[PDB]
């Protein structure tokens, strides 16, 4: 129902699997008894969020994280609507939505 | 000053002739396809420690140095960046680059310059001045001397094809450039074989490291 | 008498790779922002220069709190609590514990990029442990003149003699930044605008403009030429040096113009004598 | 009679950090809200500009109640109980106590950004390694050219004389509350518009406009020439000088235009001294 | 029972279990004899809680305390009701729910 908030909510799920992807990457880095930076990882995603300056910065963000994060099956079956509904709605919009999916990616793992 | 730049990298390997302009030159273009026609690049003479046989060991601060215009980094960066070359049988390999400025100084020296066609010391001279009067530069030239005081030569081994060629050159310091004057004169140089590892021009202080040995 | 120096300085030409930002995501990009007529120009944060002016007072003696190991790269406090009265550095630019919590004397805008920003990206190829991999990354670099201006509250001072150096370590710059500093890009300025006056009120913040950035001639803009010339700017209390006065003097009518009577000089060194001497008579050195 | 002076003011060009709201982690966000045309502006708090003009009067010798420390950073008053006979601080801007509570002389206006505030936030880092809670910070900064409007009833003044060094103050306005050592901002204006007058009817509120966005073009809105040209605000009682002057006068049919009649000064200072000419007249002073 | 209630009250637990961890962040930041500071603490996040201006105000402060808090197990078991309850419903009554959870973090300790 309400077809934005479906568009909102793969955009959640899509977050979250480019930072799994993220995460599994650092995993693959360290190595031997070290803790691998997680929650370090966390506060440096979330500050990076934070640190925008409107339009083109944090969109680069934004598309550099998604690219990072790996191959993204939901974006992978969900290009257009994402397309469109990150090049549309106000940038701090979508960075409420991308902190929100920060907080909600912990169920996966 | 900082429109032109001083390609430098940590070169190491086995030790070189102590007249490896050509070796030198050849295998850089060997790996290196756009340097064989680019114009305003040039190469520093390679530090070290020499040997009893006119061969040179590669220290630490031994390092390739080029010579180039900003505007051609590009150009050549891809090609030399980690990048490994081999003289004759001897294996030499290329770090990161490093840049470094052209800066000013109140005298500047050349190892070892070459103007076609001019042998003694008095025309060499003569020709250096009218290539220094051509760049609008101003100074007084001096050639660096031997030990007995004899004006020094230095001697480029071309060994194009079979054969191999001999063009002489003369060690010229000239002083009271004024900066901007000196700037120009480190960027031109004189003689036209920088490509061939010797027309680039250097602060005064190694002209006294050369003359001391 | 409070006592105020002001000036507007700038660079010379060349590379500038200085202050990157967060590097999004291969490309050390170069500090940018918006700037007159609205196109993007590269700029040098403040705390840079500031920084730089601290390592030169701590080479040449100048009792420095902050001691920049050069080595391990940590700052050592040379006494936990800060003292003003008996630091060079405490004394200028101020501290904040978070005490006394000084205010500082010298106040300080970012550099400015004479001509705006184009393009003049740089192929960069950092290693990899990954069997000897070489993978290519961007660096933005900018071919410019940096401009900025900066403020002194002579009488906020503690011990007055110690504006005489700061003006030496803006004439005698370090390298800015240091490592990041990939072309080795001066900040010993090639021409200055200098007003030393008793008032707060001060003009000249960004005179040097030029544009155009086919040349590198970096000319005056009209506005400063225009204050100078109404009656604003005190031509007794102007100071003008570098090669800007080489431009200046040969256009027509600088006999006539206000700005003849201003102190000008070719040689910055002669600017540099002259104006020392000014205040060490206005603040009885 | 009653007489009052209004003015709108523009500062300067250049890089400004001056109020700050809340920090939300790491970012000092400059004060920003929406303005003319729906884009969000930076402003520059009116209590900050008033806290200037006590400190310019404290400078300047004077008598103040409020005595800003400049070393413990506190504030001290000579007397508890408030006097706007003999102060020049109580008399011009009030006091409340929570006594007399008086009303106040000045009344100014929040400084607006010329320019819409778009991005442009500041990195802040240290030296090296050993970085701590302290070690990265983010500043906002703004490219633009303040402007606000201000007010004052002189026939409230306790003293009619107080009302020029208040002018004096206005032209030679000391830093006004920001990141001065990062970010150092001129506040003396270059352009003004004042109104001598006898009505509470103030017109010439903000009218300094931008050409361009992302630009320093500052031209004057067109319902305020509309405004001069329609017959209301009479020319006589308006006072212009400032660098706007020399766009006023490049204008086509300017003298045929009632601004013409206006006095307008190229010269800031001349203005000033005729402006305060006609005041001394006006007040018996 | 009226399942928006029941949304309601899982908003509340994880807007408490995301002050429970910015608190266990704050004891590990302080450090020696020091007190730690919670009622400092409070009183600041009620603060900045009372202070916003619609929208984006308060909604990005929503979502940054959120992810400031890190792990937390009831805004994992539901998604997508909490995260359309944040990006719908008008921002006041998320501020006065936050405001409550405040006061009812502390039946947890």
Avoid at chain 1, 19 to 28: D, P, Q, T, V
Avoid at chain 2, 40 to 54: C, D, E, F, L, V
Wanted: hydrophobic residues 35%.
């Amino acid at each position: 129902n309400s077809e934005e908030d479906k568009q909102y909510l793969i955009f959640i799920k899509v977050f979250q699997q480019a930072m799994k992807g993220n995460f599994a990457k650092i995993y693959a880095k360290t190595e031997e008894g070290k803790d691998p930076p997680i929650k370090k990882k966390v506060e440096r995603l979330r500050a990076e969020l934070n640190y925008c300056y409107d339009e083109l910065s944090f969109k680069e963000y934004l598309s550099d994280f998604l690219v990072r994060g790996g191959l993204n099956k939901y974006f992978n079956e969900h290009q257009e609507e994402i397309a469109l509904l990150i090049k549309k709605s106000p940038w701090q919009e979508i960075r409420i939505w991308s902190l929100l999916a920060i907080a909600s990616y912990k169920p996966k793992d | 000053s900082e429109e032109y730049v001083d390609l430098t990298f940590k070169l190491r390997g086995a030790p070189i002739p102590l007249d490896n302009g050509y070796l030198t030159y050849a295998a850089l273009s060997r790996i290196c396809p756009p340097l064989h026609e680019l114009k305003s690049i040039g190469i520093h003479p390679i530090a070290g420690i020499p040997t009893r046989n006119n061969l040179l060991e590669l220290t630490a601060q031994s390092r390739l140095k080029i010579r180039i215009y900003h505007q051609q980094i590009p150009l050549i960066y891809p090609y030399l960046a980690g990048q490994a070359f081999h003289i004759g049988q001897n294996f030499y390999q290329l770090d990161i680059p490093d840049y470094k400025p052209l800066i000013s100084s109140e005298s500047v020296y050349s190892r070892l310059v070459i103007i076609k066609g001019f042998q003694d010391s008095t025309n060499f001279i003569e020709a250096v001045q009218r290539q220094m009067d051509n760049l609008g530069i101003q100074g007084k030239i001096e050639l660096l001397t031997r030990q007995d005081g004899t004006p020094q030569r230095r001697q480029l081994t071309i060994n194009k094809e079979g054969k191999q060629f001999k063009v002489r050159g003369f060690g010229v310091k000239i002083s009271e450039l004024n900066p901007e004057d000196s700037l120009t004169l480190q960027e031109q140089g004189i003689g036209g074989k920088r490509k061939m590892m010797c027309g680039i021009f250097v602060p005064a202080t190694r002209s006294k490291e050369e003359e001391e040995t | 008498p409070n006592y105020y120096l002001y000036g507007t300085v700038l660079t010379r030409y060349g590379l500038a790779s200085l202050n990157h930002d967060i590097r999004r995501g291969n490309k050390t990009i170069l500090q940018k922002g918006y700037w007159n007529n609205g196109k993007i120009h590269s700029f040098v944060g403040s705390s840079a220069i500031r920084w730089a002016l601290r390592f030169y007072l701590q080479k040449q003696g100048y009792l420095v709190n902050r001691v920049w190991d050069e080595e391990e790269h940590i700052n050592r406090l040379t006494s936990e609590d800060f003292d003003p009265e008996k630091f060079y550095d405490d004394d200028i630019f101020g501290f904040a514990l978070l005490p006394n919590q000084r205010m500082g004397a010298l106040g300080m805008n970012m550099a400015v990029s004479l001509t705006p920003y184009d393009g003049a990206v740089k192929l960069g190829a950092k290693s990899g442990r990954e069997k000897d991999s070489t993978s290519l990354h961007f660096t933005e670099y900018h071919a410019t003149r940096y401009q900025y201006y900066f403020g002194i509250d002579a009488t906020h001072l503690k011990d007055f003699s110690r504006i005489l150096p700061m003006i030496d370590g803006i004439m005698n710059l370090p390298k800015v930044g240091g490592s990041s500093n990939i072309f080795n890009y001066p900040f010993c300025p090639d021409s200055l605008v200098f007003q030393w006056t008793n008032h707060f009120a001060s003009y000249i913040s960004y005179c040097f403009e030029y544009c155009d950035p086919k040349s590198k001639e970096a000319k005056l803009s009209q506005e400063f030429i225009d204050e100078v010339e109404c009656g604003q700017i005190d031509p007794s209390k102007l100071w003008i040096g570098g090669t800007i006065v080489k431009d200046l003097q040969q256009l027509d009518n600088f006999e006539s113009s206000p700005l003849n009577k201003a102190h000008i000089y070719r040689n910055r060194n002669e600017m540099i004598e002259a104006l020392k001497t000014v205040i060490k008579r206005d603040l009885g050195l």
